[PDB]
């Protein structure tokens, strides 16, 4: 075992703590490999290699080549081979490999951590385990410890090791494989010529491929072991293999090593390639570490935000990087100075917080005491924190001071008189701050690395003395509104569930000039009940989670209404006072409860939503003490510490079922990024203050101090800027809350106005030097204030610009005015691109610039064409602020009753420009003033004037609603096509379902072949009955009693269904509800269950709480039954009899029902009586159908008759459901509650926590009940129908978020951008997912199914037949048909080899797809309406397309198959395209499932990695066509033909016999130089007396320019002469023991020809030894006898005793293509050669004597008739010849009955076809095995030999005696000799024994033996390993002695058996030398090469 690996006699544990002990004082000095080498070359290198070898490995095996077991894994497993050559280079930039530290081993200078690396690969065998390296490390560490970063190091350092082995074992496993079968062309050539001079000639060039020692391996063996062998070729290998005295057989062993070490180090290779993938390294780390063995003490480091631990890790490297000291003192002499801290906390009375000086505020006493230097940026950036808010202020302004000179200089020639250009430059600084303040932010955020925030780690939720109550402020226009405020309340108590966390809404009763209208008490008091049934619901530990808090208002001191002390701020106090016992708070009485202490409170919004588990990190983070708030004493404001932390926000991606161009124009930042950690802003890295912008977190007595003392009454909601100025604030940017954004253009003006109106009211606190105001906060004020100016000055100044100046360039100055706002986005853009002074060479990551580069223009355009609008509002609103500001008015509390817009409509343009009606009539106005002075401002006007005119034009556009996944555009015929295939999809279910322990779908069903149900159940096949029942009752099909009736049934027999801890097995009986086999469970079935009982329950209570309003339906199902009967009458064809005036009528009567149907479908009010009358037309429709019927018989008119029926229940449905008492609706509230409560249970029955393996995450693939082990794998992609399952099981609770985020994610390129890498990638995977849930435009998993949808439609258009790919049933039959099943896909999703090989077509697939594209999908739906593809019940399963399976000459073959489990989906798909997605809310409608729904959207990244990647036509499986031209000048050839019982052998001239039960039909010999025996058919030319054979063997005409077909089922003969050709082809039947042999013959000429037709056959029924031995007996037996219609010859042997056989069998001539003529025979042998002639020379074949038709007991009997045809030129003549047999003679008459008759040779060669491919199928063979099988038959039943053994060696043996002691008598035997000694392979044996009983099946007998050749040691290991798989054979046969298998183990037998035995064998192998099934293919190949020109004689 040497190969080029790396292996150091693997020493196991307890010797790696001492070799690495050694290590540390004195090691290496050595290594088992090391070569001196550089990192990024060698990587690079490694890369080339790896991909090379891999493509060459694809490129190769294809061809046809055996792989060997090593090169499995590296084509197998390339992609995970890849990323982990991939992850690093990414994490070992250059720089940051330089620091590690040297280790000097023997000159050259390595990495310390990467040189334990080559000791360990080494000690092992190539695998990694945890304990192994902790060891290592252990032992390592004894002297010098490993710092922080190089312990972070080895999981990214071992990989680099482990691919250099890899490398190392491929280039040479590559190697040795081309020049392994480089020997065996060269012995091709050695054989070919038996020359022994030019031998040395071809020998002496390979003289440097014989040191190698793996050529001679495969040599030695094919010479020696071969065949021919010679006494030259191995004269000189020996000889040569002297050098180095290796003798021969060292060698011989070398080759078994370097082989299996080779295959084992690969597979450990991958191996351990995953392990460390799939292992955690920081929880590994945090165990080995040193550092933080003191850090676990004394110190509270273990529940502190494991991010924020990292940051005080990097704190303290830092400290120690840049310091003269030490890492492990650092950690160290920080405590000591931190013990002098002080407790400081209540809980903080233990411990030491050594954070206070590493982030704390004793920072810089703690560097200066360490005596660290600051690095340069840490110098300026406190340079910027000393100097404060100016060093912000000040960039930007004289960036703006710049851009005003340059414009002023630039601007300067056109006079300006000077009091006009301070107007301009004021009015055009503003989009210059603009530009600079963005600069500034791209600049700080390069620079300026983000901001932390440490927090505790509240792993059980939030403890003691931190109380948080979720006050949401509320509001309460209720009625049903109030239902949503609980649900939102619901949901975020579903967020975070745990810890002592309170819930509450505070709400205020709108603004109304009473103070109590009294009326509020009714809403009140519902409200209060709804509270108190939601504490019922979760009534654990007695907590009464869920409050209520509701304010009385107070009147306004100025005017209004009563509004309280305060609209918001005012709620906020007064709730801050009650929780601090303060009991005069005018709330209310009675609901004025809270829970004592409640230290903080949530601020939140009636409509965003929370993070899982989001409060746990904010509380933690202000509970920190380093965080909590000091206050000053001198003047509240908190000086040092943090009363408010606000969370970083992020937008939805879409508005539920709304998304317009509006929402994607003006939102950029969309999505939930899982990879970003931090985000960086200016205000944060620059002032330490953010932004409370409306949501947070505040201590209440601070809040209370810091409002309280200076807050005063009449003040705006601008309140959060003061707010947050107040105490502090700082953003966390850890937590998210997302939000939405509106969509129609209406309410955006509506928020900004009223928060520029904040602002402006803020600007007395600016002018203000009094009250309380920060200078950064007055700054931030005046720059909200410039903002909201920047559109008046832009606007303004382009007025004044074009009327003052108007000179001819006035172009440029618009143009900056442009730029500036195109600079303005962009310079965030381009910060995308930056590399970070090139970082690292970047992979394929495309560039998709296009989308935000349109989506920037687009931005930009709309706002300069809306900016008159937004300028003209915010003016008003300016203009009413400073109102109040000045004059001080009382309107300035105004909320939303501004009666400006109070907009009260849906959008429309006739609305906007009425409402608008200012800014384009101010822009005229000001174009026709500014236009006639100068007589040059029009041309610059217009264009731009145009632009602002059209502005409510653009704006209605963009207000307009868009499809995205569930408002898509369907129109009417396609929506009206897809409801009518699905409620004729609909039909199985009514077919199948009847109570016979039923109401369980019967899955599969055949049609053709006898049709049966298969009572197998599923639990998807539940789901998908149940979501189809509810979606045939959204479509009114069935009436509402019959939904109840179903649901109750299944619920009941889903209740009385055996459970396992609530699961459900995977098979069940639908019959007798017990378990099929193995008890088995799979995750898949329960979720599915699960989600499809969700929606049910959902369902339920939906038409449960208003069971009225539901009761009606919509009306349309008895549109589509009308459409299908519509449709199947026009296929009735109406040419008969009576013409056609009955369909006449019918089309009538059918027009007019259908309108109307549309009359009352017009009509609003619904008349319950004009439905009834409709059912008399139904009736009549059903009584001329019946009439229809009762004259033709046809099928499809049964068809009419069933489509009328079901239209006239469903009318009768209708009626039904109208026919209601609708009175008392109060039991059926109790039926649909009972049923949605029975229904929920089951829902959460389920407990997944036993499936979940906690050591790699993710759920297993099943449960086995047996040994109660789980199976192994587990579902470990993202493209799997497990994602349902997995989102429930965490939304239960029972699983953690490293589930979900530890699956999947990998990116293929296709087109411009990529999608989701799956196994086997058929949409099947895909689409569930779509069905059940919710899917929004910006998610990953719509764009994926939008890419894979339009890959599918290409590679369809591409293959040319009919897109949609899914698994079904093809085309394969086995016993007891049954089409069976599997797993298909497309070749570039598949990740799974050999997917590009089944061109299957699934017809439910198109249907699936529809959703996404319905018209594509109907296209492809309606050509597959073309072809066969509808059955009974709707679509088939599959359709098959492979040439291999296609038979005859049909383009396609049709699967005869329904299953249950295919047929649900597409009508769930048909219900969510046709009405919205009903299905898409009633899933989502259950709060459990909306609080995790937020893990959906997230965005595509941006980056697609991309790995490694008429074909499409060439690449489908194509079976072998045995081809043969002219086989008379060429070697013969053998096919066998068989029943099972009846088998017959064909020669290539038509010779052969015919064996029935082992016995004899035709005598045959075996004579290699004669090949003239068997049944001949022979022509005779009437006119010339010239008589041939149709095979022309016996006769031999001149020319013959033959051709001939040996393929499966049938041998096709060709042969052509004189104008003449006679084709022919001989089959056996089936069900009869037939065989036909039909000649075909056609003519082309010009004449007439007349020509006969003579057979010939020879009747011998023996035991195929007695009529060999004495065959004058066996011929005189014979009773050859002719009875009436003489057509027919019987001959039967004459019954001696009562233990002969019997079998009659007879010949049939069964004439065809013939008017009348009779036949003649000449039933005697002797007559027909005649004394002294032959077969080629014959007597009858002469003028005269002519089948003078001799019968009776006849001394050499024979069977032959002759019968003269006539054919004329041009058409066609045939004749089939039957060859039957029977075991008695009233079985024959049983038998002539049917081939007789016309034609019948139709119909049984599909049944041939059918029967071969069964038993084709029954054992694993294969078409090109079978041709190579068929060719070992032909060597073993012929005395031809070719491939036996030498001629020197059988000489001495074989004395055929010693054969019966090894139990092998070898009597009735060809016997085989396989020998095998490797027990590496164990496959030749398999395919060995495979082929014996194939050729068991085809009336071939052998037996086989298998030579053990090992010696002792193993030999009895070998011979159990080999009995375990022959075992199956080595029992007897169905009763015969022993059976035909052998096993022999050489060394206890003797030598002289062994001898024998390969004297006596006909046939020796080695497994080595070759391979089965290709050792076939090499002898035709050698064996070849006067015999020509006698052909012709």
């Known amino acids: 075992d040497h190969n080029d690996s790396i292996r150091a006699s693997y020493m196991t544990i307890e010797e790696l703590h001492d070799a690495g002990a050694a290590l540390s004082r004195d090691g290496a000095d050595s290594l088992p490999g090391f070569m001196e080498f550089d990192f990024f070359e060698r990587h690079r290198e490694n890369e080339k290699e790896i991909l090379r070898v891999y493509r060459t490995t694809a490129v190769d095996a294809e061809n046809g080549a055996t792989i060997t077991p090593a090169a499995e894994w590296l084509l197998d497993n390339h992609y995970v081979i890849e990323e982990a050559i991939q992850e690093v280079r990414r994490d070992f930039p250059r720089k940051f490999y330089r620091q590690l530290p040297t280790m000097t081993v023997g000159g050259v200078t390595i990495p310390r951590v990467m040189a334990l690396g080559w000791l360990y690969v080494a000690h092992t065998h190539s695998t990694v385990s945890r304990e192994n390296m902790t060891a290592l490390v252990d032992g390592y560490q004894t002297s010098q410890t490993l710092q922080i970063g190089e312990l972070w190091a080895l999981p990214s350092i071992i990989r680099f090791v482990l691919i250099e082995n890899l490398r190392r074992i491929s280039i040479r496993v590559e190697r040795s494989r081309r020049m392994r079968q480089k020997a065996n062309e060269v012995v091709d050539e050695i054989i070919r010529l038996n020359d022994a001079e030019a031998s040395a000639a071809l020998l002496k060039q390979v003289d440097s491929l014989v040191d190698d020692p793996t050529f001679a391996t495969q040599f030695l063996y094919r010479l020696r072991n071969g065949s021919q062998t010679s006494g030259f ?54 165990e080995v570490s040193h550092i933080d063995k003191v850090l676990r003490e004394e110190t509270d480091y273990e529940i502190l935000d494991f991010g924020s631990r990292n940051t005080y890790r990097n704190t303290i490297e830092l400290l120690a990087r840049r310091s003269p000291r030490t890492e492990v003192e650092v950690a160290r002499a920080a405590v000591e100075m931190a013990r002098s801290d ?12 050594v954070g206070s000086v590493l982030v704390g505020q004793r920072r810089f006493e703690l560097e200066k005491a360490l005596g660290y230097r600051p690095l340069a940026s840490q110098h300026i950036v406190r340079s910027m924190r000393k100097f404060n808010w100016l060093a912000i202020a000040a960039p930007v302004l004289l960036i703006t001071a710049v851009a005003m000179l340059a414009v002023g200089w630039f601007l300067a020639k056109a006079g300006m008189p000077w009091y006009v250009v301070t107007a301009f430059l004021l009015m055009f600084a503003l989009p210059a701050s603009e530009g600079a303040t963005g600069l500034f932010n791209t600049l700080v955020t390069f620079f300026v690395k983000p901001f932390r925030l440490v927090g505790y780690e509240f792993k059980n939720g939030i403890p003691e003395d931190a109380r948080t109550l979720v006050a949401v402020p509320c509001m309460l226009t209720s009625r049903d509104s109030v239902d949503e405020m609980m649900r939102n309340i619901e949901v975020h108590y579903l967020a975070n569930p745990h810890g002592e966390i309170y819930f509450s809404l505070v709400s205020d009763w709108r603004d109304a000039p009473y103070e109590q209208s009294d009326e509020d008490l009714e809403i009140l008091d519902y409200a209060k009940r709804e509270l108190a049934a939601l504490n019922s619901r979760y009534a654990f530990d007695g907590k009464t989670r869920f409050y209520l808090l509701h304010r009385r208002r107070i009147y306004n001191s100025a005017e209004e209404c009563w509004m309280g002390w305060e609209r918001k701020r005012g709620k906020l106090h007064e709730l801050n006072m009650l929780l601090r016992g303060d009991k005069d708070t005018t709330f209310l009485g009675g609901s004025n409860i809270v829970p004592a202490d409640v230290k903080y409170v949530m601020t939140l919004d009636a409509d965003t939503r929370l993070m899982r588990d989001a409060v746990t990190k904010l509380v933690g983070k202000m509970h920190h003490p380093i965080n909590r708030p000091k206050i000053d004493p001198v003047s509240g404001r908190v000086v040092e510490g943090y009363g408010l932390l606000q969370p970083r926000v992020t937008p939805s991606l879409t508005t539920g079922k709304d998304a317009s161009v509006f929402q994607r124009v003006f939102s950029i930042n969309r999505g939930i990024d899982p990879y970003v950690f931090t985000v960086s802003d200016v205000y944060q890295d620059l002032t330490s203050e953010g932004t409370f912008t409306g949501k947070g977190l505040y201590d209440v007595d601070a809040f209370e101090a810091a409002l309280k003392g200076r807050i005063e009454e009449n003040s705006i909601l601008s309140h959060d800027l003061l707010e947050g100025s107040f105490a502090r604030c700082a953003l966390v940017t850890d937590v998210e809350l997302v939000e939405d954004f509106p969509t129609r253009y209406e309410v955006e003006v509506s928020r900004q106005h009223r928060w520029a109106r904040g602002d402006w009211q803020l600007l007395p606190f600016i002018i203000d030097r009094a009250r309380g105001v920060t200078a950064i906060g007055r700054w931030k004020m005046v720059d909200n204030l410039r903002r909201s100016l920047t559109p008046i000055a832009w606007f303004f100044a382009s007025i004044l610009g074009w009327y003052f100046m108007d000179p001819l360039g006035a172009l440029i100055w618009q143009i900056l005015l442009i730029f500036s706002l195109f600079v303005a986005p962009t310079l965030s853009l381009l910060s995308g691109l930056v590399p970070r002074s090139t970082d690292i060479v970047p992979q394929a990551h495309f560039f998709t610039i296009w989308s935000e580069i349109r989506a920037t223009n687009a931005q930009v355009a709309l706002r300069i064409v809306f900016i008159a609008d937004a300028a003209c509002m915010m003016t008003d609103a300016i203009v009413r602020s400073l109102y109040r500001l000045l004059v001080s008015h009382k309107l300035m509390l105004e909320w939303r009753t501004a009666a400006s817009m109070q907009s009260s409509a849906q959008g429309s343009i006739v609305d906007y420009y009425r409402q608008m009606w200012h800014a384009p009539v101010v822009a005229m106005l000001g174009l026709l003033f500014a236009a006639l002075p100068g007589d040059n401002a029009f041309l610059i006007g217009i264009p731009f004037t145009l632009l602002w005119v059209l502005s409510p034009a653009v704006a209605w556009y963009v207000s307009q609603s868009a499809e995205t996944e569930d408002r898509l555009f369907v129109s009417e015929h396609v929506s009206f096509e897809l409801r009518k295939i699905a409620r004729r999809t609909w039909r199985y279910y009514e077919a199948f379902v009847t109570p016979q322990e039923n109401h369980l779908p019967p899955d599969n069903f055949q049609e053709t072949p006898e049709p049966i149900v298969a009572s197998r159940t599923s639990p998807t096949n539940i789901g998908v009955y149940l979501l189809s029942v509810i979606s045939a009752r959204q479509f009114g099909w069935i009436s509402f009693a019959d939904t109840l009736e179903r649901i109750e049934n299944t619920i009941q027999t889903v209740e009385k269904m055996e459970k396992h801890r609530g699961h459900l097995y995977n098979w069940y009986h639908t019959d007798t509800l017990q378990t099929l086999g193995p008890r088995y469970v799979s995750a898949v079935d329960s979720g599915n269950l699960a989600g499809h009982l969700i929606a049910v329950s959902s ?69 319950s009586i004009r439905v009834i009358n409709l059912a008399v037309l139904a009736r009549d429709i059903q009584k001329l159908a019946t009439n229809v019927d009762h004259e033709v018989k046809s099928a499809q008119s049964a068809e009419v008759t069933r489509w009328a029926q079901l239209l006239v229940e469903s009318c009768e449905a209708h009626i039904s459901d109208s026919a209601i008492d609708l009175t008392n609706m109060e039991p059926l509230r109790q039926r649909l509650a009972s049923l949605r409560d029975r229904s929920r249970n089951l829902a959460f029955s389920m407990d997944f926590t036993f499936l979940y393996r906690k050591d790699r995450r993710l759920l297993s693939i099943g449960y086995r009940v047996e040994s109660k082990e789980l199976d192994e794998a587990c579902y470990d992609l993202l493209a799997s129908e497990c994602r349902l399952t997995s989102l429930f099981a965490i939304a239960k609770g029972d699983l953690p978020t490293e589930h979900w985020y530890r699956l999947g994610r990998q990116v293929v390129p296709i087109g411009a951008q990529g999608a989701l890498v799956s196994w086997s990638g058929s949409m099947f995977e895909y689409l569930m997912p779509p ?89 492809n739906l309606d050509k597959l309406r073309k072809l066969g593809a509808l059955g009974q019940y709707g679509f088939h399963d599959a359709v098959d397309f492979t040439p291999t399976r296609v038979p005859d000459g049909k383009v396609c073959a049709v699967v005869y198959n329904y299953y249950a489990h295919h047929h649900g989906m597409s009508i769930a798909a048909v219900a969510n395209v046709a009405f919205d997605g009903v299905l898409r809310e009633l899933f989502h409608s259950d709060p459990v499932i909306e609080a995790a729904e937020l893990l959906l959207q997230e965005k595509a990244p941006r980056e697609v990695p991309v790995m490694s990647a008429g074909k499409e036509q060439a690449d489908l499986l194509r079976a072998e066509v045995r081809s043969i031209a002219d086989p008379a000048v060429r070697d013969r050839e053998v096919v066998f033909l068989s029943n099972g019982h009846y088998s017959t052998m064909l020669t290539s001239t038509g010779a052969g016999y015919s064996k029935w039960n082992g016995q004899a039909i035709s005598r045959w010999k075996a004579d290699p130089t004669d090949d003239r025996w068997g049944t001949f058919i022979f022509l005779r030319d009437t006119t010339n007396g010239q008589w041939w054979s149709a095979t022309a063997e016996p006769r031999v005409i001149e020319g013959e320019k033959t051709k001939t077909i040996f393929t499966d089922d049938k041998a096709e003969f060709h042969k052509t002469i004189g104008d003449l050709q006679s084709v022919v082809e001989c089959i056996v039947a089936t069900e009869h023991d037939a065989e036909g042999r039909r000649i075909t013959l056609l003519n082309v000429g010009s004449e007439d020809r007349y020509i006969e037709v003579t057979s010939y056959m020879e009747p011998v029924i023996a035991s195929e030894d007695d009529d060999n031995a004495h065959p004058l007996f066996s011929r005189m037996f014979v009773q050859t006898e002719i009875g009436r219609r003489g057509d027919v010859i019987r001959a039967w042997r004459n019954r001696r005793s009562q233990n002969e056989p019997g079998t009659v069998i007879a010949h049939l001539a069964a004439d065809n293509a013939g008017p009348s003529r009779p036949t003649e025979f000449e039933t005697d042998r002797a007559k027909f050669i005649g004394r002294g002639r032959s077969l080629r020379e014959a007597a009858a074949f002469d003028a005269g004597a002519t089948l003078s038709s001799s019968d009776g007991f006849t001394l050499d009997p024979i069977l032959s008739l002759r019968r003269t045809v006539r054919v004329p030129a041009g058409k066609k003549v045939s004749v089939i010849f039957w060859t039957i047999a029977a075991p008695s003679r009233e079985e024959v008459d049983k038998a002539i009955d049917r081939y007789r008759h016309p034609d019948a040779f139709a119909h049984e060669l599909v049944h041939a076809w059918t029967r071969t491919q069964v038993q084709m199928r029954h054992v694993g063979v294969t078409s090109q095995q079978a041709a190579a099988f068929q060719h070992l038959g032909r060597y073993l039943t012929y005395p031809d030999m070719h491939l036996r053994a030498d001629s020197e060696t059988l000489k001495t043996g074989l004395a055929s005696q010693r054969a019966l002691w090894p139990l092998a008598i070898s009597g009735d035997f060809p016997i085989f000799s396989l020998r095998i000694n490797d027990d590496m392979d164990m496959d ?97 190949s050698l064996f070849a090469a006067s015999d020509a020109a006698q052909a012709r004689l």
């Open 233 to 286: 070729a191995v004269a000189w290998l020996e000889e040569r293999l002297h050098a180095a005295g290796t003798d021969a057989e060292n060698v011989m062993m070398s080759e078994h090593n370097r082989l299996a070490s080779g295959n084992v180090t690969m597979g450990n290779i991958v191996k351990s390639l995953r392990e460390i993938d799939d292992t955690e390294w920081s929880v590994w780390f945090e």
């Open 342 to 353: 002080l407790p400081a906390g209540a809980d903080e009375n233990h411990r030491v917080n």
């Open 1099 to 1167: 369902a339920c209570r939906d038409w449960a709480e208003a069971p009225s309003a539901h009761l009606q339906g919509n009306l349309d199902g008895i549109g589509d039954v009308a459409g299908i009967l519509r449709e199947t009458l026009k296929a009735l064809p109406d040419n008969r009899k009576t013409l056609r005036p009955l369909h006449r009528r019918l089309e009538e009567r059918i027009i007019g029902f259908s309108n109307a149907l549309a009359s009352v479908k017009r009509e609003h009010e619904f008349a």
């Open 1331 to 1419: 069905l059940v849930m919710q899917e929004r435009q910006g998610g990953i998993l719509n764009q994926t199914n939008n890419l894979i949808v339009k890959e599918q439609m290409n590679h369809g258009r591409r293959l040319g037949t009919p897109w949609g790919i899914s698994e079904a049933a093809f085309n394969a039959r086995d016993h007891n048909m049954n089409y069976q099943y599997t797993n298909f896909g497309v070749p570039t999703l598949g990740l799974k080899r050999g997917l590009g090989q089944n061109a299957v077509i699934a017809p439910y697939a198109s249907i699936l797809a529809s959703q996404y594209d319905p018209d594509g999908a109907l296209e």
């Open 1884 to 1980: 030749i044996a398999r395919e060995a024994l495979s082929a014996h009983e194939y050729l068991r099946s085809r009336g071939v007998i052998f037996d086989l033996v298998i030579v053990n050749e090992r010696a002792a040691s193993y030999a009895q290991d070998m011979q159990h390993a080999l009995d375990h798989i022959s075992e199956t054979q080595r029992r007897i046969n169905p009763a015969d002695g022993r059976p035909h298998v052998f096993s022999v183990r050489r060394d206890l037998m003797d030598e002289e058996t062994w001898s024998a035995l390969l004297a006596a064998s006909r046939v020796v192998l080695h497994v080595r030398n070759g391979k089965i099934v290709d050792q076939i293919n090499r002898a035709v």
